[PDB]
């Protein structure tokens, strides 16, 4: 018996090196295996035959004649049709389906956030580079001025002045302390500066870590309903645009009001175009499409996307058949037998996951490794300086 | 049906020339006319006034112009536009109950993150606290000096001040009191410093974590005493007369202020006022009808906001020539539509639904913390100068 089908992957697709095979064996895919199982159960023979138009089916507006795969069914050409045929009222009127062998609905696709490895020197981010530079400048200036003032006209020293300033910046105490009024003035001012700077650093770091903590990634459609820095869209015209158009739900009503102000255009001519746009929008763009294709894409390398939240609507792909055919019984019963004994789950996992090309808030060592590297370098430099001093001590 | 073009009430639909009929127009009053017809069940064609004004009494000709002129001279049957109900027009035509209430409001630039001023690092703590800190530092230094000098058990005045200052800054102290009273003073000062510094750091973190842009004015009286932000209405208009014809003193003061204007705090057009406030960088505030203000607050670039509450109250109402056999049904239709929950729907659809507009914090910049650098360099200069002066004095 002829079997109608279409080439949407990961459903029936062209087997690699198709020249070395012909007929039913010329194609492999989810629907291919499903039809194989159904044939084994009901007990008939079939010859795969792909649709010519490449369209699932729709009533031509000028002429009530159908156009597409359901067209190839309703006019007696085809015996059955195993494909992602979304069952709807118009098709149910003229073509009769079985129980849905695989359920689905509108989902959300977002760019997968790459694990942003913190910079090796991310610990300086709280303060700007200019502030660090001016800190170094001021440290040198204060040390020099303290030396100059205290020295001419005590225990201090350019080396000792630098040591005192460095230890005062880091709040680690000073063995020596100025005994002259001007030295005391400069020391107190340096103390004020270091205190303010350190408090600001700590507070800004706290702000960074707190803000980076109370961020809720888009985990639902309502979360999208309250987002403005991220835009979303659908196909140019399909069941999704119609679903939002005739939507009696408040959240989807708001999203459709948003999409009404479509400028700059969010809609897309082809699904691959939308996937590319999201993959190139750098997390500023989201897409709405069928959950099944979203899950499949989230597994086909590149792994630049993921599915969030849950299904917004409910549909079901179903096995069609000519109205008044003589296969409703066996086909429906075989579908239900397959679903009940867990074959469709196996097959879906096989084609979506098995043959897939993919798949704590405590401060981590990666956030700080810069200071550790600085410390190791300073220790090595200290060992080197000690060796040099030892050699020089020989005189 | 005579209307006027003012947005959003009557505007040219997409493809103003490619769209013909009653679909050439879009806006709030179009939907309102449709809803009024759905009850009246009349036949109408969208129209526009000729002169370009809603309507007014001619200075000398006394010939009604605009929508009122068209209505009173048989040119049109009904009018649907933002007509300000008033006595003068009520004398010649019969309005309906207002389908939208409004009043004078206040328009300002949406406040932004002002560039942090020098000495912004003191924001976390009030100046009262800083003054009390200085006073307590002096007092504790003096008390320690007294106790040390009178019960020696060396802590001079200068060394006492040095010890207290180094204590308040969590730095090492070369000398520590050996007398019990001195130890009491030191421990108390230590507690005070610890608490104060922790509070400073925490409040600074709170400041840096959440931003709160607060408008300088909360109402008309708020800026009636500001005396810093210019505020003026149209050079000649209804609001100017209202302030002029006011009998309440709070608005009398604002009117007097607007009278003594240098430069004249007035404009010739509403777009002029919008541009002025947008380019005045938070120095000009415009008073206009709350409808237009809420409208602008929802249009790009969304650089302005409405503040305060309405000062006066007015209403927009359908109009109809005297004796028309259509005043009563339109009045009833307006009212029933109003309480049916529609005019709110239309206002939301046009003002808000068709709205041009409905964060990882940043590192600190020198602008935030330059004041302490200035203080540091000033202290260095002062210290060099003082050491030089002491050297010169001791030299002689």
């Amino acid at each position: 018996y002829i079997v109608t089908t279409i080439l949407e992957d990961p459903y029936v697709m062209l087997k690699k090196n198709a020249n070395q095979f012909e007929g039913n064996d010329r194609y492999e895919g989810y629907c291919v295996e499903l039809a194989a199982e159904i044939a084994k159960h009901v007990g008939y023979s079939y010859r795969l035959e792909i649709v010519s138009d490449g369209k699932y089916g729709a009533r031509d507006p000028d002429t009530k004649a159908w156009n597409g795969m359901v067209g190839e069914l309703v006019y007696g050409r085809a015996d059955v049709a195993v494909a992602p045929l979304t069952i709807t009222l118009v098709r149910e009127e003229v073509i009769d389906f079985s129980k849905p062998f695989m359920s689905l609905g509108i989902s959300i696709m977002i760019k997968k956030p790459q694990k942003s490895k913190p910079g090796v020197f991310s610990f300086l981010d709280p303060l700007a580079y200019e502030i660090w530079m001016c800190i170094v400048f001021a440290y040198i200036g204060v040390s020099v001025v303290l030396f100059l003032v205290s020295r001419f006209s005590n225990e201090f020293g350019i080396f000792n002045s630098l040591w005192f300033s460095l230890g005062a910046f880091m709040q680690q105490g000073c063995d020596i302390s100025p005994r002259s009024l001007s030295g005391r003035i400069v020391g107190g001012v340096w103390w004020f500066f270091t205190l303010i700077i350190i408090s600001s650093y700590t507070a800004n770091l706290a702000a960074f870590l707190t803000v980076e903590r109370m961020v809720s990634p888009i985990e639902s459609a309502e979360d999208l309903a309250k987002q403005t820095e991220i835009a979303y869209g659908t196909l140019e015209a399909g069941s999704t645009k119609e679903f939002f158009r005739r939507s009696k739900i408040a959240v989807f009503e708001k999203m459709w009001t948003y999409m009404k102000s479509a400028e700059p255009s969010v809609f897309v001519r082809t699904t691959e175009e939308g996937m590319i746009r999201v993959r190139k929008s750098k997390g500023k763009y989201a897409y709405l499409l069928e959950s099944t294709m979203n899950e499949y894409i989230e597994q086909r390398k590149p792994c630049d996307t993921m599915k969030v939240g849950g299904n917004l609507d409910s549909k079901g792909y179903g096995i069609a058949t000519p109205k008044g055919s003589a296969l409703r019984g066996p086909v429906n019963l075989a579908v239900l037998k397959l679903s009940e004994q867990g074959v469709l789950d196996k097959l879906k996992s096989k084609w979506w996951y098995d043959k897939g090309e993919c798949g704590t808030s405590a401060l981590s060592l990666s956030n700080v490794a810069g200071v550790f590297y600085i410390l190791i370098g300073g220790l090595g430099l200290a060992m080197l300086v000690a060796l040099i001093e030892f050699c020089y001590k020989s005189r | 049906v005579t209307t006027i073009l003012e947005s959003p009430y009557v505007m040219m639909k997409k493809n103003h020339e490619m769209l013909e009929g009653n679909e050439r127009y879009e806006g709030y009053c179009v939907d309102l006319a449709a809803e009024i017809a759905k009850h009246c069940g009349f036949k109408y064609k969208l129209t526009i006034v000729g002169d370009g004004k809603y309507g007014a009494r001619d200075a000398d000709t006394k010939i009604w112009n605009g929508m009122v002129g068209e209505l009173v001279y048989g040119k049109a049957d009904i009018a649907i536009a933002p007509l300000t109900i008033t006595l003068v027009r009520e004398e010649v035509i019969d309005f309906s109950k207002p389908f939208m209430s409004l009043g004078i409001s206040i328009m300002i630039k949406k406040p932004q993150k002002s560039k942090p001023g020098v000495f912004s690092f003191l924001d976390p703590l009030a100046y009262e606290i800083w003054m009390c800190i200085v006073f307590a530092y002096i007092g504790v230094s003096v008390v320690l000096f007294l106790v040390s000098r009178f019960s020696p058990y060396e802590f001079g005045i200068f060394n006492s001040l040095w010890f207290s200052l180094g204590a308040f800054m969590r730095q090492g102290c070369d000398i520590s009191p050996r007398s019990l009273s001195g130890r009491i003073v030191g421990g108390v000062w230590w507690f005070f410093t610890l608490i104060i510094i922790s509070s400073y750091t925490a409040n600074l973190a709170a400041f840096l974590t959440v931003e709160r842009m607060v408008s300088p004015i909360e109402s008309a009286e708020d800026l009636s005493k500001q005396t810093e932000i210019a505020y003026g209405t149209l050079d000649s208009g209804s609001t100017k007369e209202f302030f002029r014809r006011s009998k309440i003193a709070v608005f009398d003061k604002m009117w007097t202020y607007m009278r003594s204007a240098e430069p004249s705090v007035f404009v010739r057009t509403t777009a002029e006022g919008v541009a002025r406030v947008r380019k005045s960088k938070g120095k000009y505030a415009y008073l206009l009808e709350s409808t237009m203000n809420e409208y602008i607050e929802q249009r790009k670039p969304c650089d302005t906001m409405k503040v305060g509450g309405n000062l006066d109250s007015k209403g927009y109402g359908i109009a109809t020539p005297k004796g028309s056999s259509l005043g009563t049904p339109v009045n009833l239709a307006v009212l029933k539509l109003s309480e049916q929950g529609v005019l709110d729907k239309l206002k939301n659809k046009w003002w808000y639904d068709k709205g041009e507009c409905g964060e990882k914090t940043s590192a600190l910049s020198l602008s935030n913390v330059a004041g302490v650098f200035y203080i540091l360099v000033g202290g260095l200069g002062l210290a060099m100068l003082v050491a030089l002066i002491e050297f010169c004095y001791k030299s002689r």
Binding site: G141, V144, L148 | -
Partner: protein, 169 residues
């Protein structure tokens, strides 16, 4: 001995600071006035990689008033250069007419003051400049920094020379 090091360092610091002030190579930023990358400078912003390449002019600088005033009149970098020059002159005048023991002291004072002036000028320049658009600092800025470092080193060396010489008495 160290007098030669002091003098050559003073000359080098003055040259570096004068070059940095002169060169319009302080900032690398993408601006819109040029209608684009730009090697902005202390005095005149000067375009690059654009239609008006090379054809460049002075800038327009218009509490905060005072910051604009001081930034426009770069009096602090100029003061640092002037103090460096005057300190070098004082060092030269101390090389001759010696046995004063009060000249190189002033030289070091002036060198330190020049360092502080350079620090202040840098702070003011950066604070006023700021007001995401990436940018970078040209070698004029690093020349100013090197001049400050040399000024500090020269001040310390000069005062060390003074204290050694006055330790003779």
């Amino acid at each position: 001995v160290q007098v030669l090091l002091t003098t050559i360092g003073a000359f080098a610091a003055f040259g570096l600071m004068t070059i940095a002030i002169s060169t319009d190579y302080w900032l690398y930023t993408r601006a819109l006035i040029c209608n684009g990358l730009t090697h902005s400078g202390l005095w005149r912003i000067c375009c690059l990689e654009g239609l008006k390449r090379g054809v460049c002019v002075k800038i327009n600088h218009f509490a905060e008033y005072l910051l604009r005033v001081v930034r426009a009149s770069s009096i602090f970098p100029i003061l640092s250069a002037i103090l460096l020059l005057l300190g070098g002159v004082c060092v030269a005048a101390s090389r001759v007419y010696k046995s004063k023991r009060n000249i190189i002291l002033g030289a070091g004072i002036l060198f330190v003051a020049a360092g502080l002036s350079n620090i202040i000028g840098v702070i003011v320049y950066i604070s006023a400049n700021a007001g995401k658009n990436h940018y970078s600092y040209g070698w004029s800025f690093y020349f100013g920094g090197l001049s400050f470092i040399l000024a500090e080193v020269i001040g310390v060396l000069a005062v060390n020379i003074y204290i050694e010489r006055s330790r003779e008495a």
